[PDB]
Amino acid sequence: AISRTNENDPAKHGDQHEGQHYNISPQDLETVFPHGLPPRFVMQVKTFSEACLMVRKPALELLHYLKNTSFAYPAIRYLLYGEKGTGKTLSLCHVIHFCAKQDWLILHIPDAHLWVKNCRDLLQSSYNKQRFDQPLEASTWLKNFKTTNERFLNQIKVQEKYVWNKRESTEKGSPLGEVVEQGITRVRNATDAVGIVLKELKRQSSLGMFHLLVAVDGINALWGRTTLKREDKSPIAPEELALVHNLRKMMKNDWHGGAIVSALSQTGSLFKPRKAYLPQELLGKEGFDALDPFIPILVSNYNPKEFESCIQYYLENNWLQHEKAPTEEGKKELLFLSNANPSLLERHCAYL
Amino acid sequence: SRYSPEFKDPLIDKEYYRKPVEELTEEEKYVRELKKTQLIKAAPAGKTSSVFEDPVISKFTNMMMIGGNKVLARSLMIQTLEAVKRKQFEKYHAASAEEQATIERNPYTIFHQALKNCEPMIGLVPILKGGRFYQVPVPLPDRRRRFLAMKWMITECRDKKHQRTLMPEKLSHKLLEAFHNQGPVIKRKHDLHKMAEANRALAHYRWW
Amino acid sequence: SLSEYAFRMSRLSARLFGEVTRPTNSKSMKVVKLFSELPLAKKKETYDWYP
Amino acid sequence: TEADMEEYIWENSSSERNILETLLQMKAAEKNMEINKEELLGTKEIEEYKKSVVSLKNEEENENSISQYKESVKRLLNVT
Amino acid sequence: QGMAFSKSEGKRKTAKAEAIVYKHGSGRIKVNGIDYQLYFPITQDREQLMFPFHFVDRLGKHDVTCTVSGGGRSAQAGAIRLAMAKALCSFVTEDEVEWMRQAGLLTTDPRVRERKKPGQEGARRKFTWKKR
Amino acid sequence: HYVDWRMWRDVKRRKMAYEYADERLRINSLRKNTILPKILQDVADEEIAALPRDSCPVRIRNRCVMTSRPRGVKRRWRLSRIVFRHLADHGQLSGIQRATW
């Protein structure tokens, strides 16, 4: 009631809906978010059998910016930042849902930290002998990309011939889905296929064929360090990974026709202290220079209204099973123990 | 201990202190004034006044702690309470409107009852009589029943039979069985009950 | 790695403060240490240990 | 080199280079031929932006210097 | 600025805390210049800071600025608990102070690490005894 | 008049080791680098291996100065634990007491 909004169109959300939960339909959830949703938020969808996202000011601000986007100008970079667990990822998801219902082409990188960390199969790129390719990481992403942008994957057609190997090759003019299918099928060409997909969407959005959203969660991974090591145990730089090298190019505002929304994350990062959350703190010198100029959007803890609306939404699902939680003294403790942090609250309520 | 025998234990109960003075009996009133003169031990870092405080969960958490690692012991505990709640929400959502009335989704109710179904009513005390030991049936104090129920549940979950099952998974499964009077911890209670009934003729060996 | 300026600066500071200026490996810096103190046998506690 | 300097200088930096290219792209988008670098990088706005990035790079980063940098960039790029 | 506060000290093992409790506030605790939720990521630690204010029904009514040093995280939480409870005694009634004393909230915990003794393994632990 | 012949053999070792310390230092320095030619360092090896064995400082033993004990000596006082305690227990070592805590 007081925690839910009937407005399920992410394009008609205004300040009047702040604090209220809007329902992401199972259709959009399966299509727009086959990846990228917070793990603890994917658990909650299962147990409540519905995905309801709170309309908050961080996302509201972005929607505003992305409604007044001048597609003639270069791509604006927006950067969500905030302390751990404040809702940066679900703010970014709110936005993605918006653009997907506006028929933008979505280029969602679920978590970029995965690309600099825990890589089993690290092959030397054939296209460039100085770089490494990540078939597993590259293949996984392509499948999800295909899910989200299946309608547009045929209409879009390559503008150049890409030779996979001696035998196979994509010929100019063929549909883009064919390039994605090569990567999905031959994971040896998955990294090279991802490079081509990025190379085309950037080039063709400037031509005005579609609007492009580049949404990179955990963007601070691209200019940091990796835990990947060579055969001789020497550390590999993010510049050397073919998959990171190509995504870096998507972050420059030298293309137009879309927007670049990103979110920072210390969770899952490499070589960053627990409490680092400010943009230059997490990006470093190299990373900050690569995004200058960008518009920082702050995400913070629930304000008293947001906090109350969350509790009511948990009570409304009978999630708060303890006998004292509905009480006002129960709420005071939830509030204290979390400091209104969205993540601490959710984690605390998953057993109370 | 570093406390002298003079220090008394703290009573951490909000409502106890916020009870109307008139309701206090003459005896209850006196003890309340006596404590105004007594030294009180510092409240330990475990129990607080919170409304969510449960002494049975706290004891169960400590009984599964290894080497002072209470952050890990409690994380397992809350992951178990969460796994139980999620298993009971899946079962409730897939149940018919008639069955739904039955299904308990409160994990604290389930945990509390799950352990109460494992507590034994009688035990066995080895009594050395005539150079031979006899498992004599004896009544058990309530503390010992509640200890045994928790200890049997934890020892069952820590058995190596379970291959690569995480403790929150194992324990939530075992707690749900015991909630329905099933499983190997309920069985261990019955085997104890059967032993004691079989040796009911030896109960005269007890001298207390 | 050090930039040429950073390198040429630390060599200038070393000349000023009287530290080794030539690039020297750790094995050869023992020569400096050897002559930077007294030999153990020359220290008073050693050669004058007994009354 | 820039790596050796212990003080950030905005002149001949990335942010100087980047904000230059960004505005030229914005002008080309409007089909304007006013491409004088000195004209572009002279406005009072570029100065406030320059203050913010140098303030970020040289003193402690806090949510106040981030908010200040935001209003500068938000104003150069015509984001309302 | 004319704001009322009391400040007190607390000590737990090798940790020492100083708390400034403001007569009026929102529930903001700032340990060593950091929010209490970020200084103490462990819940049990945050539950110890709640304890003083919850017991007297004053969660969300005061601001706290504390500093703590020494010990480990949980001994720091218990030193801050004691420092905050003591400073909070100025803003509650004398009956509420007594109840806080009888809840054990106002006592210095004397339990501190005991020395190892020679010829033993630990403070109490003995080396294996060999009958034969 | 030293406590025994083992002390007397250490008295001589300490004295000889002192006599040759400068020579030993100089020769080590030659052979303790990568700068010099190996044919020269090899000569140095031979040279220092030819100095009397009792000039080698590792052969000095810190014996109790009072009783000649080769182990159990506190180095600040050069005394064995038996001798140290005897003076400490009678009150004759300035500022040293039994520790209790």
Ligand SMILES: Nc1ncnc2c1ncn2[C@@H]1O[C@H](COP(=O)(O)OP(=O)(O)OP(=O)(O)O)[C@@H](O)[C@H]1O
């Ligand atoms: N807008 C929202 N609607 C509903 N729940 C939310 C919202 N924002 C946060 N939450 C809850 O709080 C949790 C915050 O996690 P989330 O991934 O959104 O944050 P984050 O800032 O990206 O985190 P991290 O610092 O770990 O990267 C979510 O899992 C969900 O439980």
Ligand SMILES: Nc1nc2c(ncn2[C@@H]2O[C@H](COP(=O)(O)OP(=O)(O)O)[C@@H](O)[C@H]2O)c(=O)[nH]1
């Ligand atoms: N196998 C293969 N991969 C390509 C080809 N063209 C681009 N890619 C991939 O996509 C990325 C695009 O890089 P880019 O330098 O912009 O390609 P270019 O425009 O041909 O120079 C490359 O790093 C490759 O991983 C091609 O012809 N064959």
Ligand SMILES: [Mg+2]
């Ligand atoms: Mg995140």
Ligand SMILES: [Mg+2]
């Ligand atoms: Mg021990």
